[PDB]
Amino acid sequence: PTVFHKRYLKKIRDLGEGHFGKVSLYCYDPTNDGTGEMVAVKALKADAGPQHRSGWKQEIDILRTLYHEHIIKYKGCCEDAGAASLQLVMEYVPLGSLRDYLPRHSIGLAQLLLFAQQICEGMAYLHSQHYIHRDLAARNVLLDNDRLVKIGDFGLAKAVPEGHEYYRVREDGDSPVFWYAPECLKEYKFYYASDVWSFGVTLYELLTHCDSSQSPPTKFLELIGIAQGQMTVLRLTELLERGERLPRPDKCPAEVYHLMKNCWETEASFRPTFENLIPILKTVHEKYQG
Numbered sequence: 001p002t003v004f005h006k007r008y009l010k011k012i013r014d015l016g017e018g019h020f021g022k023v024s025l026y027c028y029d030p031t032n033d034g035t036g037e038m039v040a041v042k043a044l045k046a047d048a049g050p051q052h053r054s055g056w057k058q059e060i061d062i063l064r065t066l067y068h069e070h071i072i073k074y075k076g077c078c079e080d081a082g083a084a085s086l087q088l089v090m091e092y093v094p095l096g097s098l099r100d101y102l103p104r105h106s107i108g109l110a111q112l113l114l115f116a117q118q119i120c121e122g123m124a125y126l127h128s129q130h131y132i133h134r135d136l137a138a139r140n141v142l143l144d145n146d147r148l149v150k151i152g153d154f155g156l157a158k159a160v161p162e163g164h165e166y167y168r169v170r171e172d173g174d175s176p177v178f179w180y181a182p183e184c185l186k187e188y189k190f191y192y193a194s195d196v197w198s199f200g201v202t203l204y205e206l207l208t209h210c211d212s213s214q215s216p217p218t219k220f221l222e223l224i225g226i227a228q229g230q231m232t233v234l235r236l237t238e239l240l241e242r243g244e245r246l247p248r249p250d251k252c253p254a255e256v257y258h259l260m261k262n263c264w265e266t267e268a269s270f271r272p273t274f275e276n277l278i279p280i281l282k283t284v285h286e287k288y289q290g
């Protein structure tokens, strides 16, 4: 319900961008004095079509209904008269994404597992509200402080229809295929368990400290090759069905690699849920923290 008056919004810097949107850092100063608040403002590009505009209004509604310590805080909206929609105003998460932060800050295994646990808490909460994320990756996990992480973007999140166990996708060029389970790539169905697969890929990112040369697109494209025409996804699907997986990251314990592999079960029903992961991660964290 909170309305931001565009007259007090001063742009500081870009925070991220996608195909049909951009997130920017703004100082919202209704004075000019030191009572200024820093906010993350997400805007839909003016040239976006009806499918993206309807999806935008759904995204804004999704963030309004979500309130959890490991989910970015919705702050309000303001009229985006330039794009003729609304701008989603959220809290500014100061340390940015783990994708940006990890290659520059060598973080201990213990803090990595704490983040892993926190992502699961935020995800079990999202699944309890009957939503699927569809874009769980380290670029979407924001660092507030060294002991606090938040899921910071919901651009692809969808409500799971009432008497159904999955959502039917309709794959696009923006689909994060390298974080996707076989059932998403093949049958065009996204289950709650499909997010658990993406969590396994996010856990692999964290354990590689988000090193570009070890990234899921880099590692999978080395396995598929580049002279494959329109067949990257088909080749990805068949390597996954042969049981090929991203490798064990350097210094990753065998137990945590096994947990990653368990999130990556080909059969979606064999994967743990986010509720199952929480006491497991709690326990593996206490272990390493000690």
Ligand SMILES: N#C[C@@H]1C[C@H]1C(=O)N[C@@]12C[C@@H]1CN(c1nc(Nc3cnn(CCO)c3)ncc1F)C2
Residues within 6 Å of the ligand: 015, 016, 017, 018, 019, 020, 021, 022, 023, 040, 042, 072, 090, 091, 092, 093, 094, 095, 096, 097, 098, 100, 101, 139, 140, 141, 142, 152, 153, 155
């Ligand atoms: N459309 C579209 C766009 C692609 C979608 C996008 O940018 N989504 C996001 C997850 C990114 C970052 N972001 C946010 N980032 C922050 N903090 C922050 C500080 N430094 N940095 C840059 C190093 O990461 C980011 N606080 C809130 C956010 F909301 C939201």
